[PDB]
Ligand binder design. Sequence first.
Ligand SMILES: *Cc1c(COP(=O)(O)O)cnc(C)c1O
Ligand SMILES: *Cc1c(COP(=O)(O)O)cnc(C)c1O
Lengths: 381, 381
Amino acid sequence: KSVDTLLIPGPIILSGAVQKALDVPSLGHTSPEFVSIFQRVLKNTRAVFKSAAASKSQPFVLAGSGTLGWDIFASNFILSKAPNKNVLVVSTGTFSDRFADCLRSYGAQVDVVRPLKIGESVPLELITEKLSQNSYGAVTVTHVDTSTAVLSDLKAISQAIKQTSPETFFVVDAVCSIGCEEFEFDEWGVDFALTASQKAIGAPAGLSISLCSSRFMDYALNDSKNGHVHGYFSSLRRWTPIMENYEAGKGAYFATPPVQLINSLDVALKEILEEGLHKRWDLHREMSDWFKDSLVNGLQLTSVSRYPSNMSAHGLTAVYVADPPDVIAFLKSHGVVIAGGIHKDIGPKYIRIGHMGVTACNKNLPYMKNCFDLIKLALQR
Amino acid sequence: KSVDTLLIPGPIILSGAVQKALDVPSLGHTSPEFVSIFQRVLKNTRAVFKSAAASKSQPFVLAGSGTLGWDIFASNFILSKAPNKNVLVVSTGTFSDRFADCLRSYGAQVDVVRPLKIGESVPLELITEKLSQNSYGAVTVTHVDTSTAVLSDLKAISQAIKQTSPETFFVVDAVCSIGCEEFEFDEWGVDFALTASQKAIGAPAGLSISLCSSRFMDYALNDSKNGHVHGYFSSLRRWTPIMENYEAGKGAYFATPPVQLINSLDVALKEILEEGLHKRWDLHREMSDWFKDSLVNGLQLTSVSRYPSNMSAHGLTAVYVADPPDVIAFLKSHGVVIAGGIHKDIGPKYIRIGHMGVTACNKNLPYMKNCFDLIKLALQR
Ligand SMILES: *Cc1c(COP(=O)(O)O)cnc(C)c1O
Ligand SMILES: *Cc1c(COP(=O)(O)O)cnc(C)c1O
């Protein structure tokens, strides 16, 4: 027997290079050789977000998970003397909501705008409407909500913000979009974007990867004006000098970074950048279309996210099924792991499949053809 | 050429088993096989702290670094309606102080008690004195401060607390003590202990490993009384159900745990437990004595921590040297990495060496004999 094929929306299967890049002896975090690795990582992190070094945006890579990104933004936005604590949360599913929770836990007055139906993005006009009737210090959008597998139009939302409330910070939960979905940090005027290491970036789990715009960084570190951070580990003020030195190939110290994880992430970022982001987004699209096509049209199923449509993310598939547990158990027995629903409402009414990174790209891995064949067979009983 | 020999106080060299335990394909975090790994890890985590399952203490293993442990304790102690926000910090070096900072950043009124001289522990009578003239909600002690390489007598301090202020929570920063220093969670009445994965535990960097006493857990989750956590990722309230299920071999989800890191930690914990904690503490002692003996007596150097004495930790050595940079550079050139000072005062006046985990135990690794030979030669010029 072998290891099961991971086809859930994070963690995902790692390419050989990034996986064996984990099995490496420990390096001192301030050693010249580790400093080399992290420097590349920080610069490739901004690149992967589609941010130019000239934008003066500040990248942050630290031990934690995607979720840390929420704490980081909240803790650095809702400072002690925060002038505007109102945040407007654009919800497309479970994670948007959980982000809303995190926000509130930090002292932010949160407003939630939702879609007209589950599996859809929030209407743009409703977002601008909300952006007008009130003045939010920040607005969040979950680029791809993994619970509903819904894709939000960041280009549109970013323009509505620039148009209706330019001063409000544009925060994007890109955990399940960076690496497989078109995402333009600089172009779309994103102030804070956060992603994880185990989704489309194709790295091991254990890292929080976020990026700060010059504008937000300007706000976050203005102690005399906005006050201080009610926290510590998540303090941008404390980590900036560290990320700065590392990018300058200097090496300093606040909290020991995950050397093995950073080494792995180094390879993972190179791989997505060596072949090109656009190319990598197209592969995910091709994979996603073929698969939903097979599921929705081929097996006459219904997608949780509207399909076909630009509302359906390319990093995963969420399709309703009669008996999700049975389908999941069936695939499991045959060496394939897919996921359940995780959603306050439709939770046990559907299943979720991965198809990100090497499993989406790299047309030699039969992972997905086999996945579909199995689901196909699972619905036979 | 080869990889340099890591002889700094964290990260440390990993044994072959735990290192290759990193290079493993990703598992779904709720998959039966991963649930198996994490369950063992959580139970061996309490074991490694010397806590009996019967104590009902709750372990926490999450993505982050030792430093997260501070945020976790602070965030869960200084709740919204915290009845006693006063914390007494027992400082033996830089980290005690930084912990003090973290504490203040979270809203705690901190008092700092220090040693009479650098390289010494704080006098016990001064601690009880301070514990009497005021009533602290909690007191922290850095079991081994890596900046000064000082060891505090937890047995003594724990009795002074039980004696002078039993209600005050006993918090221990065990980041550089668990795995190489005698540490009794249950026996000494520790309420919150935090450690990291890269020190004496001999695991890769990237995990925060802490343990909560039934008593503290009682306080931390009493929302109606003490209020809520001003935070999210560090909320014990949010992670408890997760650690609980995992220990029950159930598997649930709050924030994706570092599957590869947990797998590695699994092996690392087994190894220290398979040979026995006491045995593992003696090996560290033997190694530490031999090495400081060689440095202090052999090369007539002066330890930053009082030596010989019970104030000198066994996980590292901090010795003053004429030209630290030169000694460090010299060792580096010959494939060995030791560290600088990191201390507000004596910072550039000394060096630091590791000797923890496989490099301290496993009497086949010539790492330390060679380290000394090199320092010996470094002082020849
Ligand atoms: C190494 C160390 C820390 C910091 O641990 P990180 O893993 O770098 O966050 C905190 N306390 C002590 C006593 C240490 O030795
Ligand atoms: C997977 C995911 C998260 C949580 O990431 P962790 O790494 O589990 O903390 C947050 N947001 C979205 C949109 C996700 O898909």
